[PDB]
Structure formats: structure tokens, C-alpha cells
Paper text:
[name] catalyzes the first and rate-limiting step of polyamine biosynthetic pathway. L-ornithine is decarboxylated by ODC enzyme in the presence of cofactor pyridoxal-5′-phosphate (PLP) to produce putrescine. The ODC enzyme is an obligate homodimer with two symmetry-related active sites located at the dimer interface. The ODC enzyme from [name] belongs to fold type III group IV decarboxylase of a B6-dependent family, having eukaryotic [name] characteristics.
Here, we report cloning, purification and crystal structure determination of C-terminal truncated [name] [name] (EhODCΔ15). The crystal diffracted to 2.8 Å resolution, possessing four molecules per asymmetric unit and the solvent content was calculated to be 46.69% with a Matthews coefficient of 2.2 Å3 Da−1. The four monomers in the asymmetric unit of crystal are arranged as two separate dimers (subunits A, B and subunits C, D) facing each other at the convex surfaces. Each monomer consists of β/α barrel and β-sheet domain which are arranged identical to previously known ODC structures. As expected, the crystal structure of EhODC contains two equivalent active site pockets at the dimer interface formed by residues that are contributed from both the subunits. In contrast, Cys'334 the conserved residue of EhODC that is expected to form a covalent bond with DFMO is slightly displaced from its position and has distinct orientation that is structurally unfavourable for covalent linkage with DFMO. In addition, the residue Asp'361 of TbODC is substituted by Asn'335 in EhODC, which is not expected to interact with DFMO. Tyr'323 is replaced with His'296 in EhODC and the loop containing His'296 residue is positioned away from the active site. In contrast, the cofactor PLP and substrate L-ornithine are accommodated in EhODC active site with polar interactions to facilitate the catalysis. These structural details indicate that amino acid substitutions in the active site of EhODC create a novel architecture which not only makes it resistant to DFMO but also lowers its catalytic efficiency by weakening substrate binding, as the reported Km values for L-ornithine for active but DFMO sensitive T. brucei and mouse ODC enzymes are 0.24 mM and 0.09 mM respectively, whereas for DFMO resistant EhODC it is 1.5 mM. Structure of EhODC at 2.8 Å revealed two salt bridges between Lys157-Asp238 at a distance 2.9 Å and Asp122-Arg277 at 3.2 Å.
Author numbering:
A (entry chain A): 5 to 144, 157 to 296, 309 to 331, 338 to 365, 379 to 386
B (entry chain B): 5 to 144, 160 to 186, 193 to 227, 230 to 292, 309 to 335, 338 to 365, 379 to 386
Write the structure that this text describes.
């Protein structure tokens, strides 16, 4: 965007080579809002619960919650961060398959009422320390196998515990849409099975792994259509755990250069750069505008190796790099974008 | 490690599931001293400089500096930490190929007199902001380029400290490749006195240190030449021991025989219970943090979370939250 480029340049001008930091973040408030209203439009029946683990930055977590998003917390620290921002503990879901005893007890005292289980031991762990917490069964390491579902449901019933419903999380190898279709059908069967156990499961957590099925508008339409076709009980509500989807367009990294090496190899020179970070995606050189024939060279950018991209020859201390749409798991001053 | 086992089992018996921590560290002071004296006994002509980047934990960094070790710092934070512990800036070497301008200017004021280079640009940077700082050339295209950099060092009027490289017979080639560079630089009108062989140590060690010490003599470096190294994993490994607690268990029958998964806070031991020969063993998988991560797939007996713990021997190598100093 042009507004992001101009705001970055206005901030870069405040620095000389001697005083320039490793980099700075740009908080795209409109980028967060556009992602939320896009979700609410395409998936009306599924309320998004942001995975705080993806990006626990106070401003983003605050903004998302104010926009009506729920909260997906993996640890007690993530639980406490949400509660400190003034959000109600009912909107929080303690999504941790194996919880530390001290944290599980503290969560109960803090007012947390929703958690996830994928083992017979965790059912007993909850029954012993916080037996009032609602339990969600995780289906498909990480998850519960087909035959084990009955053994766990029996244990939840035998311990007299509350079942909120079913949960599933797909891997990083999402891409194929039909895995969500199968997992929802598998979840629908788990509901009717649990209903026979005398339980009333009202919550289906479809998990995360979004923005990995590209035509989102269409991918959201398929989930929405499948939800209707499976005919879930009238009382059932649907939540998701989108992390990468919400956090991506939230932040923009603007890094500085503090190293250069020109190396002619196999006939043509490649230029190595060292960007503001320790040596251990797509970016552009914002400081100089490309005049078409600006002599583009294959550039290797180091943190170990953050980007291999076609870039014009840059001068360390003068030239800067903008990495568009970061914050997604990538988590040093943060400047809010003007709007 | 009978003494370490008893010190842990004592601290374990103090916790119940309700208040058990994720894990605690045991700082083996004796383990550091034995590793340091092993270096000096087997490699006397090479002075060890600890890579603070490997483990910047104050207890390790302070003890090593008292034992005679130098300091290898990759950033200004590592430089300042060493100086805050009360160490002479001469013992510190700013080992960073590409330094930020602000950090380099500050390092010059802090008293840092030694740094490394591998590119022609970094030479001009040091000449522009910290010209008094001594320079080391990096070796192993980066071979014919050595002549290009040395010319830039000379033309800017900078002090050449010597040659530095980072990787059994690979060291023999690298030390010889360094010796040929020294004579090359001497013909330019420069006097390289420092040779940094790098790290990656711990290999039989005793035999490895013998080949290095022998190769040093055969190459016949000038009388003034001093030898230094950057061992990280070597010094840090035996310094700390991790004692994890268990807060997750899952039983799963696999094709006939059961495998049990565990979630805790390489080699590990169930110190909470004694394993008398046959006490029933199971293919156990131990996990850590991150909910989508895998530390061990080891042969272990059945364990109960909250009751049973884990001891990971020699874990101080690259980790960096509670430290218990091992007696005595």
C-alpha cells in the first residue's frame, strides 16, 4: 500500500546511519479490521477466537476482542493477558491438551470454564483439580484416534464431567479443502455419539489453519454449507481458532541494513545483505523507487537467511526494507499507521 | 553423576502436583572446572575464548572468566554483559562479520579493540567509525577474495590482528590455509599475530587437540603469534542439568505393544524411581512446549505425571528458569 510506504519513509527520515535501529513495526489498524469484517461476512455462524499464541501483542489482542473476537489461550500467561485487558473469561477457551496442574488450578480461580482434552489422563486431571470446567474432545501426534473417542467419552461420563463439545485442529499442510469437510462430518458423528452418552454438546471448534486455503471467500462458503447440511442440534454453536489469518495483515516490518557483500559467481554478481537482526518472505526496497532499469541483482538477505529476492543495489545506512504483512508467528518500536 | 542425582531427588520430594514447577536447573560448578582444565591440559598454546552467544547465563560467563577464559561476543548486549561482570575489554573479541553502526561506535568507546571481517564493506565501515579497532580476516568463494580484503585493510590504514576461521583433517587444511595467508599478509607489509581457530569442539578430544597442537608447530608461525579459540558447546554442555516435571500422559497400544506419550516442562533419566533390571520398559515419547516440540523417543519405564520427574544430563549447551547451584 501507498499509505504504508509513505508512513515508513516519513519515519526513516528521522534516522542517520549512526543512530538507526535494527528496525520498526507498523501497526495496520485497518488491516486488522478488514480481516475481521471479511470473516464475519463470509462465516456468519462461526465466531472467530483468536489464537493469542500466534501474536500476543497487547494492542492487537485488545483490538480483535473489541471487534467481537473470542480468545484462544494455550498457557496461563495468555489467559492472564486477556483477562488483564478487561475481557470476560467466558470468551476465553483454554486450548491446551496437556495442562500443568498449577496452571489448571489457577485458571479455575481466574474464572476459566472452557478447555480441551485428548487423553484419559487429562479427563481425570480435570476431575481431580477443577471438575467444574467444561471439556472439549479433540478429534482428527495431537488429537485422538477413532477408537479412543469412546474410551474418553466413557471416562468423561464416569467422572460426571461437563462436555462442551468437539474440537479439531488441522496441520500446516491444509491446502486441500476436503479435510475440513471430512473432519466436520466426523465431528457430527461424535455429537450424536456423545448425545447417546446423555451429554449435551453445544460447542464445535473447527480449529485453525486458515489463509492456507487461498480462495478464502469460497473456502468459507464450503464450511458454511457443510455446517447446514450435517444438521447439528439447535443448541450448538460454532467457534474457530484463526491465528495466522488475523495476525498477518496486522503488522509491517521495516528493517534497516548494516552489512553488504558483493560476490560475482558464475558470471554475474549477487549481493548479500545483513538486515537488522541476529545472524542465527517477499519484500521491497522502499528508500529508492524502481525506475524500471534500476539494475536489479539477485540479493540474499540475512537475519540466517530471511529472503532471496530480486533487488536493486542498496547502500547500508541509507536503504531500508519493508516486509509487508508480518506478525504472523514472527512477533523494535511499534508505530501505529495513520487513518 | 550420583551426586547430581541425589541433589535433584531431594528438591523433587519437596513438590506436589499442585505447586510443581515446569523444571529447574542444576549448575554444576565442578563440571565447568573439569572441562576448563581438560582444555588447558590438552591444548596449552591455544587460549580459549567462550562464545557468550552459546550460553549468556551470568553464572557460567562469570566462572569461565575467573578460570582464565576469554570472551567471544556477537552483539553489544553480550559485550556489555561481560563488562558489567567486571572484565577487561582487552579479553573481549567482537566476533561479528556485519556490525550495526551504532553498536560499533559504542563498542569503540567501551574499549573493544578486536573485531572480525569477511567483506570489503565492513572494512570501510570500521575505517569510518572505529579505526583504532584491530581487525581479523575470516577464511575457510571467500578464497581469492582474501587478497582483495587485505589490500583494503592496508589502504585504509588499519591494524591487522590476524586470521580467523570456523568449520578432523578439515582443521589441518584450515590451519595451513591460515599460515599461507599470514605470509601473504606479511608481504603486504603487515604483522598478523592473532590466530582464531574457531569452535565446534565436543571426537576423542585428546587425540583431536594433539593433531592441532602438532600442526601448529609444523607450520612454523612467527614468534609473536598467539593462538585463540571459540569453544561454545564444549564449555557449556556440562555446566547445567535440566530437571523436568511431567504434566501429561497418554497410553496407546501400537500393533500389540503399548507406547506411552509424555509432556514435560536426547538422554534423560527417570530419577524418581529406581530401575532394577527388569521392571517393565516401554517405548516412550516425551514432548515439550508449543501446541502445533519433540525432545526424546527413549526406552523408559511407566511414569505418573506429578509424581515422576526427568533428569536431562549435560544440557547447558545452548538453552537460556530457576537455577540451583550444585554443592559443594
Amino acid at each position: 500500500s501507498l499509505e504504508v510506504k509513505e508512513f515508513a519513509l516519513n519515519l526513516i527520515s528521522q534516522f542517520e546511519p549512526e543512530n538507526q535501529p535494527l528496525g520498526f513495526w507498523i501497526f495496520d489498524t485497518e488491516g486488522v479490521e478488514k480481516a475481521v469484517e471479511r470473516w464475519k461476512k463470509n462465516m456468519p455462524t462461526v465466531r472467530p477466537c483468536f489464537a493469542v499464541k500466534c501474536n500476543p501483542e497487547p494492542h492487537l489482542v485488545k483490538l480483535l476482542g473489541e471487534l467481537g473476537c473470542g480468545f484462544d489461550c494455550a498457557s496461563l500467561n495468555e489467559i492472564k493477558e486477556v483477562l488483564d485487558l478487561g475481557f470476560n473469561p467466558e470468551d476465553i477457551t483454554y486450548s491446551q491438551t496437556f495442562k500443568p496442574y498449577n496452571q489448571l488450578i489457577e485458571a479455575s480461580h481466574l474464572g476459566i470454564n472452557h478447555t480441551i482434552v485428548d487423553s484419559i489422563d487429562e479427563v481425570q486431571k480435570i476431575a481431580k483439580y477443577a471438575p467444574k470446567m467444561g471439556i472439549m474432545i479433540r478429534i482428527m501426534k495431537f488429537g485422538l484416534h477413532d477408537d479412543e473417542v469412546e474410551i474418553v467419552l466413557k471416562e468423561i461420563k464416569d467422572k460426571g464431567l461437563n462436555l462442551d463439545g468437539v474440537h479439531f485442529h488441522v496441520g500446516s499442510d491444509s491446502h486441500n479443502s476436503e479435510v475440513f469437510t471430512k473432519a466436520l462430518t466426523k465431528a457430527r458423528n461424535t455429537v450424536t455419539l456423545a448425545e447417546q452418552f446423555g451429554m449435551k454438546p453445544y460447542l464445535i471448534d473447527i480449529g485453525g489453519g486458515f489463509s492456507q486455503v487461498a480462495p478464502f471467500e469460497e473456502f468459507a462458503a464450503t464450511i458454511e454449507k457443510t455446517i447446514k447440511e450435517l444438521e447439528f442440534p439447535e443448541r450448538t454453536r460454532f467457534i474457530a481458532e484463526p491465528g495466522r489469518y488475523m495476525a498477518s495483515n496486522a503488522f509491517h516490518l521495516v528493517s534497516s541494513l548494516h552489512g553488504k557483500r558483493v560476490r560475482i559467481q558464475n558470471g554475474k554478481k549477487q549481493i548479500e545483505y545483513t538486515s537488522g537482526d541476529g545472524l542465527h518472505k517477499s519484500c521491497e526496497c522502499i528508500t529508492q523507487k524502481v525506475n524500471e532499469n534500476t539494475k536489479m541483482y539477485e540479493s540474499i538477505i540475512y537475519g540466517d537467511k530471511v529472503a532471496t529476492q530480486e533487488l536493486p543495489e542498496m547502500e547500508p545506512g541509507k536503504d531500508w526494507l519493508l516486509f509487508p504483512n508480518m506478525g504472523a508467528y514472527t512477533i523494535h518500536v511499534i508505530y501505529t499507521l495513520p487513518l
